[PDB]
Design a protein around this ligand. Structure first.
Ligand SMILES: COc1cc(-c2cncc(-c3ccc(C4CCN(C)CC4)cc3)c2C)cc(OC)c1OC
Ligand SMILES: COc1cc(-c2cncc(-c3ccc(C4CCN(C)CC4)cc3)c2C)cc(OC)c1OC
Ligand SMILES: COc1cc(-c2cncc(-c3ccc(C4CCN(C)CC4)cc3)c2C)cc(OC)c1OC
Length: 284
């Protein structure tokens, strides 16, 4: 049997410290090709080890196609191949679009569904998984209006560190119980609540919308330091602003309440992904 392995790389859609992401062609179909830097090889090994353990298949998790290691003259090339979402990341999408009630709820419920699927242990099945780097750049927008969660390079299974802007207080003040798997679920719930805030800002009510901003845009610099974030989140205990205009809208009022219950200083007081899913389904 012939095995057609050739991928044509067509355009670069992402470049960073991690490496690059390319739109590629395989047998007439779009694929996304993440090429890792040597600096970030451990992210390729973690994501590969996870998918070798459990082949995740969920509509709100970026679809795995392949992990490839190729031998080069004086180096190894590490590639992760996934489904391609031509609408790009939620971060990208929120900059140039506003949302209505239905599209805002569809986005956040799809993210909650993906996250609950990661978090749940299923017997027979999958281990429980914490993402550890949830943010709007690690969420992709699909044509059907739902999103999917990407990048399991920092993920931890039960049975590089997170982006500083989205770190929970217990990460910033180094009190997180590192031995306790539920601590990592609670870290993801904090980051989820910041994503919920980013999205809700872009939902129109009464002819009003907020400009896209990243969480804590008004209180920390670009590329905030660990110390910058610790002072805001742990010492001053600041939380993202809820604008007055949200309290005229039943959807945004319910989402504000949800956000608050993701941001408790005490990690054990935070809602579970499954409770967020239920709350979101009952809105509107
Ligand atoms: C090695 O590398 C890559 C390969 C492929 C690829 C292309 N055609 C066919 C296949 C294939 C799948 C499954 C079987 C078998 C399974 C069990 N058996 C009992 C019956 C049938 C055979 C062949 C593959 C795996 C795609 C890749 O990327 C998109 C690869 O990596 C770049
Ligand atoms: C990596 O991804 C893709 C792979 C393929 C692909 C290519 N050749 C053969 C296969 C295949 C055939 C048969 C089995 C099974 C059937 C039942 N039992 C006997 C066990 C073995 C498995 C695999 C596949 C899945 C196509 C894709 O898309 C069109 C892929 O995605 C881009
Ligand atoms: C976050 O993480 C990963 C993401 C992806 C991924 C999958 N589909 C589509 C994309 C994408 C496409 C296009 C744009 C822009 C560029 C062109 N124009 C300016 C508007 C649209 C942005 C994003 C990506 C980046 C793949 C990954 O791995 C192979 C990722 O890593 C796990």
């Amino acid at each position: 049997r012939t095995v057609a392995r050739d991928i044509t790389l067509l355009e670069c859609v992402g470049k960073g410290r991690y490496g690059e992401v390319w739109r590629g062609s395989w047998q007439g179909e779009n694929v996304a090709v993440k090429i890792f830097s040597s600096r970030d090889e451990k992210s390729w090994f973690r994501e590969t080890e996870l998918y070798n353990t459990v082949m995740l298949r969920h509509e709100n998790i970026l679809g795995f196609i392949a992990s490839d290691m190729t031998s080069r003259h004086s180096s190894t090339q590490l590639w992760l191949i996934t489904h391609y979402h031509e609408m790009g990341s939620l971060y990208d999408y929120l900059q140039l679009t506003t949302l209505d009630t239905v599209s805002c709820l569809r986005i956040v419920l799809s993210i909650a569904s993906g996250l609950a699927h990661l978090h749940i242990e299923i017997f027979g099945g999958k281990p429980a998984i914490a993402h550890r780097d949830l943010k709007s750049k690690n969420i992709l927008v699909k044509k059907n209006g739902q999103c999917c969660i990407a990048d399991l390079g920092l993920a931890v299974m039960h049975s590089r560190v997170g982006t500083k802007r989205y770190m929970a207080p217990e990460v910033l003040d180094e009190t997180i119980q590192v031995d306790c798997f539920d601590s990592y679920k609670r870290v993801d719930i904090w980051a989820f609540g910041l994503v919920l805030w980013e999205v809700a800002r872009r939902m129109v009510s009464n002819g009003i919308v907020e400009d896209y901003k990243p969480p804590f845009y008004d209180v920390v610099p670009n590329d905030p330091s660990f110390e910058d974030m610790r002072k805001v989140v742990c010492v001053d205990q600041q939380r993202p602003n809820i604008p007055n205009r949200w309290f005229s809208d039943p959807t945004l009022t319910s989402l504000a309440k949800l956000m608050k219950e993701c941001w408790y200083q005490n990690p054990s007081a935070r809602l579970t992904a499954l409770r967020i899913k239920k709350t979101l389904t009952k809105i509107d």
